[PDB]
Design a protein around this ligand. Structure first.
Ligand SMILES: O=C(O)[C@@](O)(COP(=O)(O)O)[C@H](O)[C@H](O)COP(=O)(O)O
Ligand SMILES: O=C(O)[C@@](O)(COP(=O)(O)O)[C@H](O)[C@H](O)COP(=O)(O)O
Ligand SMILES: [Mg+2]
Ligand SMILES: [Mg+2]
Ligand SMILES: [Mg+2]
Ligand SMILES: [Mg+2]
Lengths: 139, 481, 481, 139, 245, 139
């Protein structure tokens, strides 16, 4: 299946040229970019691993693309996302996050169902990749 | 004879009727204080009524005055508590209509109580005989009063963090038909729509608990559909479970049930009223729940330009009360929505402060005192062929809801959801790349381009391309830019 | 593909937009059932919109329809749940305005829930672009729906039994100034007014809890003033203690406090909203408390003839919800009140059944299903010189409230109360004897006669004789007798 | 003091001619009249003593006046009221009650105050005439 | 309707045969907590009658052996088993032992078959407090269904019918005692009236006859009872004892 | 094991001739039919996947049989069921559901037991096929 976290995952995988234009758009607004990796695709896995620090002072999109492609060479198989952070009062939060790399095959998830009280079901979303192998060897 | 001897004989407090403008409620020299509550009324006096006297009458009967002099004023710091009409301007391109600014002392109002604020500002003056029509257009709620209110339970920022969704508008859909579906079929529609790409679905505003579907049946089945779609996509998913009910006890029962089963969100209807709304906004913060407000009934007083309450005021009251979403218009859908008015509503809901912006209907500068931002919801008669217009008018932080525009798809609910999401992401991608997407020769082309590789979107564009809702607005601006 | 093969291809359920009048929401031959909810709308279509299509649009979007066809209708008994516009008449003396009758199946509505009834009937249709103006004029609430509602907690009959007062209207007064008084001075005004003859006083609608007076201070001092006046007169006495507050928890706290200290009555404001109102109406029955409803905010939607909700509908909803009093107009005071409309409101509140009476705005026959009778309250800018008019227009079962008309008396609060009570009893006595008291050459003479032996009444007539509120009404009838 | 229960007690004591017109008014409405006596003036003394049965079938106001004046001759010093009952659906209750006789001197009441919890006062209205003498000897 | 008139000397026998409960009174009642439609949706079973069985012997079994019988019967194909009407809590088996062991048997059969399974846990008890305690315990351990006996009476039945809707529980009514007044043609209450009263009160199941089994049941009367319980409206049908539309 | 959801699963697998007769019965009652697929056999998996829309406006049983055989050609190994829906007031629900296809080998389920309070057991029914492989690759 296709992991559809990220804001462009109903579109084809973005080319490097398309990614650069999105980065250019984020930096035009004064947003800080960073790169993050995980091989736990769970929807509640908030904290993907940081690829260095966010690039607060960087002004040229090419430097973001440089770090993205260094992350791609170094990280294990899995997911990479690129985020844009707006530190302005009233936001102080991420304002853009999209997937730039995904594994060749994602088995996805199943729904574990525990019998609760009455008719209630206690749900757990379980990742096939994570239950099978440790971090760094999942894909 | 003691009552005769002690009768008050002053100009202001001898018994009898004197004009409100002579009772202290008119002062053109008044200096507004940062702590004052300010109100802007559009006043249409009855023929022969002096416009300043009408403004002073509104100011008096919404603060401390009645129709005849009372000596008990003298037991109070009466000067301090009188509201002051301080500015009366003619409305542009009208003959007998005025804009009246009125200032109210901070101490008139119970802290954190929307019911008390409205009891004064809108309680009685709209029925006053001497005024033929009255509309509350705007209010300056002072920083010191705002800090007594919670503001949104969650707010736009934390909402997107809870959903892990950043960079595009959010997507939703009302389940249809409005009434009649069983709980099991409700969960099916919710499952199909979420799996097909929507972030949310929602109960219709009139779906509460009924013979054809009792509310617990709907909640349990919808949670099965929600968790199924989350495991099928790897995304956080939800559906606005409607907890609107007859009594506060029943509202709380439905809210607690939604929380116990793990719903990220509940919805409420404005017809429940301000006291229930404030109670459930506090509850939503205390119980980690997103709180969606459907504005049921709003247009009974917000539709006409001559009388009622402008929706931008409702926006302030509901952001103060603390809902996380409020329906706020589409411009291009089936419900009334002048674009300048709509853009003003969205600013009221989303900005950290307001600047005077008369073409948008923003008559007061106003800091929002770091009350969290409320998420506008655009819903009603819209379809993915309008996506370039929605992105242009409504911006990034909004939920675009497609009920008929999802479930009406000939190839099924999943296909309808997929068409809407592809249109949204393609439009945002092109916007970010620099396209002049709002132009009718550009926006529609971006969608046609994406449709070349998305069957569901091509089908949706084919079906609804010619559908528009072009009618003259009733709620319109008074100033051009 | 399978989705293309299974596409629905019937006239009614193939995908796309068709008119609401072709979707099942128009049936001129429909036979109304005793269990149907009926609504009468005054519809002003946008130019070029067919009047029957507009009525079908209102019927559809307030029942089960949306703007495009959805196959999920076919998962339901869809014909049963569609509302039916069944009659569209031109409004007399108007162009392009229509009366539209719409019937709704009983099963659409959650039992005992005003919030659900209104979510359907007024939820969205007032903002519909295709309609330039829309007003809910009347409703036929069926016997079988009414029996799910409590109706008035106490009702007119039991209220008079609790007060041991039969034969005349009841008397009241709002404390003035509206804001600023301390709790101790509030109790003083209440003591003086009750001792002087009034049955009740009341908190102003915006007196809740504020820096100048916190609510417990007012409640305790008022109960000293109430019990003092009862021991001074040998009568049951009370004052409407306002329990309006921001949250349901705080409303309940104030209600329980009022009960604990022995108050016969509490009051609430309509701005608190339907869910809080229904909750406190059940509470009032369970706790032996009279429940007075001030209609704060009503005129924001009830004032203008072209758009909003006619107050007679509010009267039905509030009598269903179960308040014991509701403000319902004076005709001759400072707030809007056409006499034929007012007389209609009072019938809606007080009768065991309604007959069609078009001059009074009563468009439906309607049994009240033995829900108790709700006490109308006449308040705002009235004085004892108008007593013959009040008795004539408003009848026996009413609270006549004189705020400024009591406290504005030059010889003090007791004198003002005494003037009002003498005028009332003298007028009722003369009415019962057969006098043509409503005639301007007779009514005023009855009062002048009583004033010859009542100094306070003579003084009040002297002070306010020439005070009237003669303005053109906005909420007016469409039929004459 | 003047006991101001009743609907005409802010007017002078009613003459027999005035009472008769009020009775005539009630009876033209089809209301049933009755006569009641007490010497406990407490505002919560619901049940004054019945003077016979209510006059359901009576059609002549003079017959109500006859019973009133028989009650006046027979009852101890105290209060007499005349009531009108409407038995029709929607009312089934009294619709008029006024005082026709009162004692020459009514001392009235005082307010007994018991210290409750906090600042609450527990009130009792106490009648001087009742606390002094038993029924039939109070005035 | 039945308070005193059945004891009046002047009538030698009296039987309540039918009632027309008006629409406007019915709407004040809950009706079934779940109802046939939602019940089949909760069980995911559509197309055939449902299947059940009372555990036997009526009395004497331990909680552990009760759970064994429930496990075997469900695993063999039954949708439900049930406590006997007189199985409540007794020296030979206290009720919590039965409830815990049955839930093990139920879940075992569900995992063995891929089907929703259950057993009507009897919460009949002396006092409302004890009935609620047994209902809450059945809910807490995940039972899809509980049962009550008619001898508990109308006020407890209405209370637990509201509870069942509020707590997502199927409510099975055993009609214990019904035949003391419903058997004879000359006197008492015809069972079709009990059907109306119990459907109004809001039970989800009620025993209504077999025609061919060991308990009384003329087919015309039985068919009438089933119509009263199952139809959206009744037409006059005198052979089946339906006297009112 | 044999999954005994459906209303005819204690009978042998139905032939196409038998299925057509059940379809003819449903359609003679005015019921709408549809076809659904899953490879999660859990008893609480309420929403099997839809094969197109329900066949509301179809009068010929051969048309239902056609879609069933197209579903059999296209769907992955697993389960197919045929349902009949009664939209009549008082039902508005499925009135028949039976299995038309099942995998060659269904491993079934085990019962997961978590220690609750006291003696209470928190139960979870777990599918062997689902825990081992993602949707579309389970059978
Ligand atoms: O009931 C309705 O019509 C909707 O569910 C829309 O359905 P569709 O998506 O099928 O049009 C929404 O409640 C309205 O948009 C509310 O209006 P607003 O947002 O203006 O308050
Ligand atoms: O605030 C006011 O003005 C009043 O206290 C009247 O004071 P006065 O008695 O001094 O006029 C009442 O709330 C209004 O009558 C309400 O209007 P309505 O009854 O029309 O709802
Ligand atoms: Mg809606
Ligand atoms: Mg007031
Ligand atoms: Mg004592
Ligand atoms: Mg048995």
């Amino acid at each position: 299946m296709r992991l559809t976290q990220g804001c462009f995952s109903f579109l084809p995988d973005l080319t490097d040229q398309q990614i650069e234009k999105q980065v250019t758009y984020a930096m035009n607004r004064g947003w800080a970019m960073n790169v993050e990796w995980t091989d736990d695709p769970h929807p509640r896995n908030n904290y993907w691993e940081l690829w260095g620090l966010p690039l607060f002072d960087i002004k040229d999109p090419a430097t973001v693309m440089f770090e993205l492609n260094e992350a791609r060479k170094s990280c294990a198989a899995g997911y990479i996302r690129v985020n844009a952070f707006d530190a302005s009062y009233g936001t102080e939060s991420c304002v853009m996050s999209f997937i730039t790399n995904r594994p060749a095959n994602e088995p996805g998830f199943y729904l574990d169902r525990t019998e609760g009280v009455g008719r209630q079901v206690i749900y757990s979303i379980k990742s096939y990749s994570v239950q099978a192998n440790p971090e760094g060897s999942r894909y | 004879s003691v009552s005769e001897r002690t009768r008050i004989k002053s100009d202001r407090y001898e018994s009898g009727v004197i004009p409100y403008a002579k009772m202290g409620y008119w002062d053109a020299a008044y200096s507004v204080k940062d702590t004052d509550v300010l109100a802007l009324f559009r006043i249409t006096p009855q023929p022969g009524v002096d416009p300043v006297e009408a403004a002073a009458a509104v100011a008096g009967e919404s603060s401390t005055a009645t129709w005849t002099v009372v000596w008990t004023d003298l037991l109070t710091a009466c000067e301090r508590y009188r509201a002051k009409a301080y500015r009366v301007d003619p409305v542009p391109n009208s003959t007998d209509v005025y804009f009246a600014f009125i200032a109210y002392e901070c101490d008139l109002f119970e802290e954190a109580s929307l019911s008390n604020l409205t009891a004064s500002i809108i309680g009685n003056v709209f029925g006053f005989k001497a005024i033929s029509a009255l509309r509350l257009e705007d209010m300056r709620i002072p920083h010191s009063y705002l800090k007594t209110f919670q503001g949104p339970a969650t707010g736009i920022i934390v909402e997107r963090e809870r959903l892990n969704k950043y960079g595009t508008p959010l997507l939703g859909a009302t389940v249809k038909p409005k009434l009649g579906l069983s709980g099991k079929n409700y969960g099916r529609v919710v499952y199909e729509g979420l799996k097909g790409g929507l972030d949310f679905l929602k109960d219709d505003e009139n779906i509460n608990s009924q013979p054809f579907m009792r509310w617990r049946e709907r909640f349990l089945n919808c949670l099965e559909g929600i968790n199924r779609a989350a495991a099928a996509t790897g995304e956080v998913k939800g559906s606005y479970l409607n907890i609107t009910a007859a009594t506060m006890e029943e509202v709380y029962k439905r809210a607690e049930y939604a929380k116990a089963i793990g719903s990220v969100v509940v919805m409420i209807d404005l017809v429940m009223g301000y006291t229930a709304i404030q109670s459930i906004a506090y509850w939503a913060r205390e119980n980690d729940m997103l709180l969606h407000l459907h504005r049921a009934g709003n247009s009974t007083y917000a539709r006409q330009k001559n009388h009622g309450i402008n929706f931008r005021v409702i926006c302030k009251w509901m952001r103060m009360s603390g809902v996380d979403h409020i329906h706020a218009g589409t411009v291009v859908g089936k419900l009334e929505g002048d674009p300048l008015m709509i853009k003003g509503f969205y600013d009221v809901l989303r900005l950290t402060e307001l600047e005077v912006n008369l073409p948008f209907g923003i008559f007061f500068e106003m800091d929002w005192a770091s009350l969290r931002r409320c998420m506008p919801v655009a819903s009603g008669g819209i379809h993915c062929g309008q996506m370039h217009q929605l992105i242009h008018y409504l911006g990034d932080d909004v939920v675009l809801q497609f009920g008929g525009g999802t479930i009406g798809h000939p190839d099924g609910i999943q296909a309808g959801a997929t068409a809407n999401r592809v249109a949204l992401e393609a439009m945002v991608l092109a916007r970010n790349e620099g396209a002049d997407y709002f132009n009718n020769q550009v926006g529609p082309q971006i969608l046609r381009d994406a449709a070349k590789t998305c069957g569901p979107l091509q089908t949706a564009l084919d079906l609804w391309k010619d559908i528009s809702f072009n009618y003259t607005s009733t709620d319109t601006a008074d100033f051009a830019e």
